[PDB]
Symmetry: C2
Subunit: 57 residues, 2 copies
């Protein structure tokens, strides 16, 4: 039972590690997509500012 629970504890170490690694990849993916969207939103906020500067002009 204990060996099976070790296999399970280890499986859970692997599953939770596996999944946390999958989440690291999902996280990096959404972080990179966030950075892209943030950079995009920022490029737009910069364009908004360029226009705002030009709007003011």
């Amino acid at each position: 039972i204990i060996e099976s629970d070790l296999e399970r504890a280890e499986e859970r170490a692997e599953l939770s590690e596996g999944k946390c690694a999958e989440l690291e990849e999902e996280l990096k993916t959404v972080t990179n997509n966030l950075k892209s969207l943030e950079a995009q939103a920022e490029k737009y906020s910069q364009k908004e500012d360029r226009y705002e500067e030009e709007i003011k002009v």
Copy 2:
């Protein structure tokens, strides 16, 4: 011994699950930021156009 490895493997499952949950929370935070940023990148692209339109007008 197997139990000690189990406890450690379970501990790894808990530590890894800890990380899994932390990454999940970060994933969701970042993903939620991604989504708010998707909304902002688009609202900003729209503002890029509303402002461009204010310039054109």
